[PDB]
């Protein structure tokens, strides 16, 4: 994909955001911004220009499921890739995220290989 694709990394945990942002940078993606929760994330998605979202689930204020649903419901952002990267491993919830239209689902802890594999999978499905 375009090495200038704008990513939004959403997680309440500073350390994890560093992990994800660094992986993107190492993959060639230096245009990366961060949000600490869903409310924050949406405020940021409004200024526009974002091409891909990587989101945590459990966060204060708005969680990653409600955030996914809001993005999918917004005609300005409804087809934007939203990759879930979360500790949340209960089946009924992974199911919920995928029914809500998640582009993929990565469980914590993850390997760099997994993240890369899931990213390249989305790029191809969407022709990015």
């Amino acid at each position: 994909a375009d090495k200038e694709l704008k990513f939004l990394v959403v997680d309440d945990f500073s350390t994890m955001r560093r992990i994800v942002r660094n992986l993107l940078k190492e993959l060639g993606f230096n245009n990366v911004e961060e949000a600490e929760d869903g409310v924050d994330a949406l405020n940021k998605l409004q200024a526009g220009g974002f091409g891909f979202i990587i989101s945590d689930w459990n966060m204060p204020n708005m969680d990653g499921l409600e955030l996914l649903k809001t993005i999918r419901a917004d005609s300005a952002m409804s087809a934007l890739p939203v990759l879930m990267v979360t500790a949340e491993a209960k089946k009924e919830n992974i199911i919920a995220a995928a029914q809500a239209g998640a582009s993929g689902y990565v469980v914590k802890p993850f390997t760099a290989a997994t993240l890369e594999e899931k990213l390249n999978k989305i790029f191809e499905k969407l022709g990015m």
Partner: peptide, 19 residues
């Protein structure tokens, strides 16, 4: 076993359901 403990398990799950 209500919980998944690996990526492969998640992949297999999502796959088994048409995702």
């Amino acid at each position: 076993a209500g919980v998944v403990a690996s990526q492969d398990q998640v992949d297999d799950l999502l796959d088994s359901l048409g995702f």
